[PDB]
Amino acid sequence: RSSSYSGEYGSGGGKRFSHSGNQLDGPITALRVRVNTYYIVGLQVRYGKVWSDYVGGRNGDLEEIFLHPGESVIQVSGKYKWYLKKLVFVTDKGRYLSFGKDSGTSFNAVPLHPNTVLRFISGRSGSLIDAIGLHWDVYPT
Ligand SMILES: [Cl-]
């Protein structure tokens, strides 16, 4: 009734990953994004207290952000072409958490149903992030 999906943004390269089985650990509380001049290289997401497996490669610099207590992502925009290139996570505390350089084809993802937040991500990866998708749902009870 409340879940929705935005995606997939990127190419068909790489291999699928999904954090759907990480939801049970809790809401998103932190993000790691490995970045270079051209690409989103890797991703890791913290669900409650539990970091997901890392996906992607190592040819970039690791950027990390903890969300403030009770803060959630409510919109994600970005850029891609043959791989993912840029991500901006917009939060319900007004923060715009940006990773990567402005180049490529844009996407702009918002949740379909009322009062939902980013609950987990999925996508495709190898040595880079080939594609990403955003999964929205209610903030967990
Ligand atoms: Cl590209």
Give the method used. X-ray
Q: How far is the CA of 86 from the centre of ligand 1 (A)?
A: 10
Q: How far is the CA of 48 from the centre of ligand 1 (A)?
A: 32
Q: How far is the CA of 93 from the centre of ligand 1 (A)?
A: 31
**Domain assignment of residue 81, given as a range:** 1-141
Residue with the two structure tokens 């715009």: 96
CA 133 to chain centre: 7
What is the structure's resolution, reported in angstroms to one decimal? 1.1
Q: 38-68 b/e with 16+ CB inside 10 Å = b?
A: bbbbbbbbbbeeeebebbbbeebeeeeeebe
How many Å apart are CA 120 and CA 46, to the nearest integer?
10
- How far is the CA of 126 from the CAs of 31, 87, 129, 134, in angstroms? 19, 18, 7, 18
